[PDB]
Paper text:
Overcoming lysogenization defect (OLD) proteins constitute a family of uncharacterized nucleases present in bacteria, archaea, and some viruses. Here we identify and define two classes of OLD proteins based on differences in gene neighborhood and amino acid sequence conservation and present the crystal structures of the catalytic C-terminal regions from the Burkholderia pseudomallei and Xanthamonas campestris p.v. campestris Class 2 OLD proteins at 2.24 Å and 1.86 Å resolution respectively.
Crystals of the analogous BpCTR construct diffracted to a slightly lower resolution (2.2–2.3 Å) but produced a more complete structural model (residues 390–594). BpCTR contains two domains: a Toprim domain (residues 390–504, purple) and a unique helical domain (residues 505–594, yellow) consisting of a five-helix orthogonal bundle and an additional C-terminal amphipathic helix (α6H). α6H extends into a groove along one face of the Toprim's central β-sheet, forming extensive hydrophobic interactions. BpCTR crystallized in a different space group thereby permitting the helical domain to rotate and scrunch closer to the Toprim domain. Consequently, T506 and E508 shift 1.2 and 1.5 Å toward the active site respectively, which facilitates the binding of two magnesium ions in a geometry consistent with two metal catalysis. The metals are spaced 4.9 Å apart, suggesting they may move closer together once DNA is engaged. The conserved Toprim glutamate (E400) and the first aspartate of the DxD motif (D455) each provide a ligand to the first magnesium (metal A). E508, located in αH1 of the helical domain, directly coordinates the second magnesium (metal B), while E404 and T506 stabilize additional metal B waters.
Numbering used by the authors:
A (entry chain B), D (entry chain B): 391 to 594
B (entry chain A), C (entry chain A): 391 to 481, 488 to 594
Write the structure that this text describes.
Amino acid sequence: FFARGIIFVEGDAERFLIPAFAEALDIHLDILGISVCSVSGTNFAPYIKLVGPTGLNIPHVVLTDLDPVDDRPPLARKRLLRLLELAVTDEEWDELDEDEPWDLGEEYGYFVNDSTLEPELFQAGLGSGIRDVIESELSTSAQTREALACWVDDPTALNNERLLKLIERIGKGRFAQALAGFATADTCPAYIRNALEYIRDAVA
Amino acid sequence: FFARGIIFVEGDAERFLIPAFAEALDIHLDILGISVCSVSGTNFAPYIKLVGPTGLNIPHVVLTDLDPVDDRPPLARKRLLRLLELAVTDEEDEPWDLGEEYGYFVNDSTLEPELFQAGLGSGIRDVIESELSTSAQTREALACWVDDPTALNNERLLKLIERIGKGRFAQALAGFATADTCPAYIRNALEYIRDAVA
Amino acid sequence: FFARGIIFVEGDAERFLIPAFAEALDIHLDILGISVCSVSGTNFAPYIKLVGPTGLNIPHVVLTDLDPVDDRPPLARKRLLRLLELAVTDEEDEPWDLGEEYGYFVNDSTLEPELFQAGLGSGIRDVIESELSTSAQTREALACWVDDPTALNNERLLKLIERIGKGRFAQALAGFATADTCPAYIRNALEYIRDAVA
Amino acid sequence: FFARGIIFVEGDAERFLIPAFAEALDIHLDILGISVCSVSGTNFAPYIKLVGPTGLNIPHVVLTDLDPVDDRPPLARKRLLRLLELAVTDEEWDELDEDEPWDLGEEYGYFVNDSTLEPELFQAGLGSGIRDVIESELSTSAQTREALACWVDDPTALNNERLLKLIERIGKGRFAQALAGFATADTCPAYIRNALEYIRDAVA
Ligand SMILES: [Mg+2]
Ligand SMILES: [Mg+2]
Ligand SMILES: [Mg+2]
Ligand SMILES: [Mg+2]
Ligand SMILES: [Mg+2]
Ligand SMILES: [Mg+2]
Ligand SMILES: [Mg+2]
Ligand SMILES: [Mg+2]
Ligand SMILES: [Mg+2]
Ligand SMILES: [Mg+2]
Ligand SMILES: [Mg+2]
Ligand SMILES: [Mg+2]
């Protein structure tokens, strides 16, 4: 490392896609010395310590999935309180029932989506490209292709878990490398765009 | 397991500078799926075998330094012939333009004089003066080099650069990358590998 | 997340040669949990802050080159003072022996002349002659350097080594590592970090 | 890479332990230019192609777990036939009902243990050190400590899956880094020693 800035992401899907969207947005990560570091999981806290104010004091952002669970809080709320514990001033406000630490997280460069990466891509308008990739990569049934056509016509009808099943057949990392070809500024999910603008400005 | 194209480079400086110049030229390596691969030396031949026609037939380019030698042919001559032997059709001051046809690009000296000739001399001086503690003498040497790039003393520049580390130096210098300071041989290799992947 | 000790080195050559010399001295870095960490340059100070008393207080050593300069103090002087400032108790041609007390080891020139002085000259010549295409003149230069290490021409050795790549060169040279060709400053740093981890 | 030789292993446990046993055995991997490469899984076939006779032709070995399953063949038998397909001359013998491809695998540098790494370490005589590490790292019950004392007195009584549960509480990679301190030539499992001698000789 010893980048001028770091984008911490969960996996290799993000590692392919984030630099592709940055290119689409004309945000120059290589000129600015910004690196994308996958933690191969959801445990950013060891990296935050090493890199945060106590450590090397390197500008950084975190991109992570909300991971909503049925009849339970989103997995990301607790994972975000842990990162905030290592980075926030010792005032300890309510954070809106401490289940709304999101806004304070964004001030510190921690960005959470509304579900998980691949449904967010579909909802951000990449549905046609995701369908192209899945039908080029997999051997598919007519039932699958028609489910994908329907989701493209109405992304609100999208079944997230059947989508990820399809993608896990491809491999999330291989899927994302193929989807990177389709990145445009208008199909970048908001949380990725926010994080790229944040880290560009932190470094500059 | 696969990339749409590969840019082969010699070392850490190109690893950091080629992606910066690609951004300054608006060439989207990550969207095109083009990666930059350093061979940490000057022997590209094993890699060209893996990914060339012999093997995976992945589109690729090579960036290498001429390495001109006093009273000898420059070192890149035999280096290119060796790569051409493994890539070309049936048929030295000869192989340069044929090499470029196959994505093999040689500069006219070595990376760092080329950057000075291309207009990055002010950036190189800024990087060196802000990262190192320097004597007035080296700072005046750098001022001469900027106002006349032909005056460049390469033993001295490289010693300065090795104090920083070639990769650290290049990462700092990337922040000054622009389209008008991109050496021709890098710009041509980048346009070539973008055309190729298309 | 943690190692029992760290050996900080400047670059790729030490990355490959320090573990080879440790094997030739029967110092078991993997059993002791000691890792070798290259800083890719000459600025050790940020790392010493992370792992020194200021931070994790992991036992560590530093291997760095003197970098002697004509009509100046050698570059390592200020470099060591900067690291000593961050490591030492309250109180230049001074700081060397105090530096060694804290695991900071400086050679007398730079790695590669030191290897020649220590007896590895025949290996360096073998590596260079078998990996490069060479002129008779460079092969006679290497023969002079082997029979008299004081005659060594460092501009020329380094140019040869950069044709190979410093890390490739050092990995090939590792195969010749022995206890009797290990420079003193490497041997002392290795014994020091083994004592420290115990 | 571009090592003179490669030891392909499954995970980071092996990545810590193999070089420790090599030191204990006075097999000089750094002098010989031999590297230990974790594939973070059990899928060596992509690496074998890149590195084998068709690829860079680099001397290499594979260390992998038998992975015995109850009422089923060992998982390693099929995983080994796949690697052998990419490396063996096209004679295609019986391999002893093709469920005994082990001997031919060892000729090609593919070494399989009898269960999985951590029980094999216990059985090779490291049981006392494994007990030390577990009781230093974990908070343990008296029931656990007495089960470990019993296994140390008679490794044949060892319960493999309770051992790995204990170790998975520590983290297999962190466990192995701590166990490396205990490596000796006499506690090296045979399959690791065989592989180290093979790759040392292939390189020399
Ligand atoms: Mg880019
Ligand atoms: Mg996730
Ligand atoms: Mg648009
Ligand atoms: Mg642009
Ligand atoms: Mg060069
Ligand atoms: Mg260079
Ligand atoms: Mg020994
Ligand atoms: Mg040096
Ligand atoms: Mg050196
Ligand atoms: Mg060793
Ligand atoms: Mg296993
Ligand atoms: Mg013994």
